[PDB]
Amino acid sequence: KWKLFKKIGIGKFLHSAKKF
């Protein structure tokens, strides 16, 4: 019920922020 599936990348955005 939000911009999750339309932007699941946000969840993986912190997995990418963990690489930097």
DSSP letter for each residue of 5-19: TTSTHHHHHHHHHTT
- Cα distances (Å, whole numbers) of residue 6 to 2, 3, 16, 20: 8, 5, 18, 24
- Cα distances (Å, whole numbers) of residue 13 to 2, 6, 8: 17, 14, 9
* Cα–Cα distance for residue pair 19/1, rounded to 1 Å: 29
Q: Which method, experimentally, gave rise to this model?
A: NMR
Q: Identify the residue whose tokens are 């911009």.
A: 3
Q: Which tokens in the block code for residue 18?
A: 């963990």
Q: 2: number of CA atoms within 13 Å, CB side?
A: 3
* Cα–Cα distance for residue pair 1/5, rounded to 1 Å: 9
* Cα–Cα distance for residue pair 17/1, rounded to 1 Å: 25
Calculate Rg over the CA atoms of the chain: 9
